[model samples]
Target: SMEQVAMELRLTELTRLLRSVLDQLQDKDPARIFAQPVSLKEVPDYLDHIKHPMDFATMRKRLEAQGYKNLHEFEEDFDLIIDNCMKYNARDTVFYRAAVRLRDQGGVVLRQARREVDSIG
Candidate 1:
């Protein structure tokens, strides 16, 4: 049946996403990436310190302020940012390619969710 095929496809994708999150976790360097614990208040100061802005830390702070935390490059809510961008006029990035591949962003990316910090079990 079509629904069976759909379930299989979505479940296959869940495996891929779970693996990707693990990959990003292995790649992330928290010692290098985070400095002194960031928040919405500190984003602009960090921007001023670096003379560059709009990086993941800044976005992370904003997401944190909005009650979304623990997001990572390949985590489930990572697509929420992409989802919001598609829902709006955010610029194109590599995330677009990932989001574009999804069968459905909400039904797949949002519902079939995982976090970067989750351990395999």
Candidate 2:
């Protein structure tokens, strides 16, 4: 009973920690472009150009689904969201500039989470 509770507590903390990071990212997007997946109808070759696509909505789904086991894994998906932006859009584009801001802001959130997790774990 004690061991199970201990493990569960750690897992729950991890879940909430990642959720904070995700929430910050979602809230920070001014245009809400990163809020959901890009439309295939709007960008016909989106998938062809970016093999790995990601978004805040998708991250939420993964979070709810318990697909994320650690901060590293969660960060991978977060980075991928920006990676796709940088890959598909030119540096001068709105999406690309927004991606840069998102990445930097998200990094601060992640760093704080990491420090909290380190002390707890």
Off by over 4 Å in 1: 29-121
Candidate 1 lDDT: 0.40
| Full-model lDDT for every candidate | 0.40, 0.86
Clashing pairs in 2: none
Candidate 2 displacement at residue 9 in angstroms: 2.9
Q: What's the lDDT of the predicted structure labeled candidate 2? A: 0.86
Worst 10 residues of 1 by lDDT: 29-38
Best by TM-score: 2
TM-score for candidate 1, please give it.
0.24
lDDT of 2 at 24: 82
Position 64, candidate 2: lDDT? 81
lDDT of 1 at 81: 36
Candidate 2 C-alpha lDDT tens digits along 16-112: 8788778887887978989889888889889779888888899999898777878899989888888999988899999999999998887778888
